[PDB]
Design a protein around this ligand. Sequence first.
Ligand SMILES: O=C(O)c1c(Cc2c[nH]c3ccccc23)ccc2c1OCO2
Ligand SMILES: O=C(O)c1c(Cc2c[nH]c3ccccc23)ccc2c1OCO2
Ligand SMILES: O=C(O)c1c(Cc2c[nH]c3ccccc23)ccc2c1OCO2
Ligand SMILES: O=C(O)c1c(Cc2c[nH]c3ccccc23)ccc2c1OCO2
Lengths: 148, 148
Amino acid sequence: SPGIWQLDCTHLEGKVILVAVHVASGYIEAEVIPAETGQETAYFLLKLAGRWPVKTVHTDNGSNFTSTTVKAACWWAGIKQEDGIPYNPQSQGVIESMNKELKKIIGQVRDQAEHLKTAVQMAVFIHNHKRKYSAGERIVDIIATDIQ
Amino acid sequence: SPGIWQLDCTHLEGKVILVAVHVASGYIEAEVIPAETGQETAYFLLKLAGRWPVKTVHTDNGSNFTSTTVKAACWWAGIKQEDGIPYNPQSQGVIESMNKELKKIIGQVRDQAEHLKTAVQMAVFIHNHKRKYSAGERIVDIIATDIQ
Ligand SMILES: O=C(O)c1c(Cc2c[nH]c3ccccc23)ccc2c1OCO2
Ligand SMILES: O=C(O)c1c(Cc2c[nH]c3ccccc23)ccc2c1OCO2
Ligand SMILES: O=C(O)c1c(Cc2c[nH]c3ccccc23)ccc2c1OCO2
Ligand SMILES: O=C(O)c1c(Cc2c[nH]c3ccccc23)ccc2c1OCO2
């Protein structure tokens, strides 16, 4: 459970927002990309796995699940690539709600930033710091407990 | 202290590698940028602070220490901006050695990747996972201990 992440892709301003969610904590990392290619997804996963102990990734769609470049990146980084089917059907709505929530935060800051990418990183910040414990606190606690 | 980071800028292939080091653990995040502008540094710090609890940043030079954009980003993200003078003179060589180490790792992978940015993220991965405890383990343990 501490090593499980879910990929998520949502759209805004004709652009693509790629999100990785640490399932047990709700902690996220995100980036803006021109389009969701294998190359972009691969690079995003490499960055993620260099920063957090990523054991398993539930991919966001069949194209990324099939992508040879994504498979290569997962091999390189020691990531088990899995499908992202909501076997628990509440897993659709939880992601839908996060996307809605992210876009809402982006709207609240959009005017502060000239570029969408800045607004997205402001949203990551606000999300991970928000007291609900914060997601940042939860991921650290979960991984630390696993270590020791 | 758990919230203290140091900025570091090094050069390779006519490009700039911007690094943030968590001082107590040796954990790093890094990016390739065309040049070290206030705007790029500001964005990098925003990303960092959205992902880890960044309380204090020792800046890498006077230009970033003075930059109005960097100051704005530090205000936004709740970061105390400080100078990075090696008051302990071993603080120069520790960074020099990390830069040498990073460039060495980049050399070991450079052929695997077409783009420098990919090689840099491979280097971040290798660095943070390297057993010496790993830096990834240390940062989580340090921050978790602080939380509790
Ligand atoms: O498969 C890729 O090209 C790719 C990879 C994995 C990888 C790079 N070199 C390799 C050489 C041998 C095996 C895998 C790789 C990681 C991040 C990326 C990638 O593309 C962009 O971001
Ligand atoms: O795998 C790591 O060294 C690493 C760790 C801690 C850890 C040590 N053993 C483990 C075995 C399983 C899971 C995590 C670890 C923490 C953060 C990271 C890491 O890599 C990048 O971000
Ligand atoms: O100061 C910036 O422009 C900047 C900032 C801080 C910030 C943005 N809007 C604001 C509006 C009011 C106050 C500060 C800001 C963060 C990240 C960045 C930045 O530039 C690129 O990455
Ligand atoms: O600020 C957070 O909630 C947050 C935390 C927990 C934390 C808050 N203050 C601290 C002061 C010191 C140490 C941890 C925290 C952890 C990771 C994060 C966080 O945000 C981004 O990554």
